[PDB]
Amino acid sequence: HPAYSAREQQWMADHPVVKVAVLNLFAPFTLFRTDEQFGGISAAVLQLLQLRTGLDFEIIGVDTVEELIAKLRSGEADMAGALFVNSARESFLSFSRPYVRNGMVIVTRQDPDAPVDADHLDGRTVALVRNSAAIPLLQRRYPQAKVVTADNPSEAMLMVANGQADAVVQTQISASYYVNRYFAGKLRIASALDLPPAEIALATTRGQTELMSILNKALYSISNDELASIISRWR
């Protein structure tokens, strides 16, 4: 399907194996634990991409987004397999077309004093992952919510479970994933947030004309039915 240009063809002939950095514990998008194979929504999407491009992908798992960006910037990785589209990073990263678009929700404890929904956050403590793209959007929409940060989505979920926050912001997809698998009976999805949907995309540095155009064409040739099939497995 995808119509690659001559320069793109050249790029792919010089890069038959492309180095894809992925966050080890960005469930259910990328999951690359000690010592398991690479899995998650984005693992399946990359395989479909492999068919569309003929490229082999070498997967580089890292714990932190600082690491993943450092490896893009140094050229050790060619692309990232899953990141949130984030305008604050657009001066140094490019994002592909999104392959997941998903509303965000708050997760609370199942206790009588928990916020009932996103309109009941006044003076409440809302946890978000440090440097999350949702932080300024949440601060503008819900200026009375008290924002605390956590290192990563696990720590953020645990702040609610252990009582250091009243609510945590996650995509609906990751919230259902973490709640059902780890906190069933302790946490719950309270409601949607009145914020633009989060989006998951591939990323490269801004220099990368040919590879990003290859990723976009290849993504374009994946139907929404294919994507929905993959994503629905992680509910």
One-letter-per-residue 3-state SS of the chain: CCCCCHHHHHHHHHCCEEEEEEECEECCCEECCCCCCCECHHHHHHHHHHHHHCCEEEEEEECCHHHHHHHHHHCCCCEEEEEECCHHHCCCEEECCCCEEECEEEEEECCCCCCCCCCCCCCCEEEEECCCCHHHHHHHHCCCCEEEEECCHHHHHHHHHHCCCCEEEEEHHHHHHHHHHHCCCCEEEEEECCCCCEEEEEEEECCCHHHHHHHHHHHHCCCHHHHHHHHHCCC
How wide is the angle at C-alpha 232 spanned by C-alphas 231 and 235, nearest 5°? 105
Bridge partner list, 30: 26
Bridge partner list, 25: 31
Bridge partner list, 128: 149
Contact present, 203 and 81 (Cβ < 8 Å)? no
Report the alpha-carbon distance of residue 121 to residue 53 in Å, rounded.
Answer: 46
What sign results for the dihedral spanned by CA atoms 70, 71, 72, 74?
positive
Q: Which domains does the chain have, with CATH numbers?
A: 1-102+198-235 (3.40.190.10), 103-197 (3.40.190.10)
Contacts of 93 (CB under 8 A, 6+ apart): 69, 72, 80, 83, 203, 204, 205, 206
Bridge partner list, 19: 58
- Determination approach: X-ray
The reported resolution of this PDB entry, expressed in Å, is 2.0
Bridge partner list, 192: 105
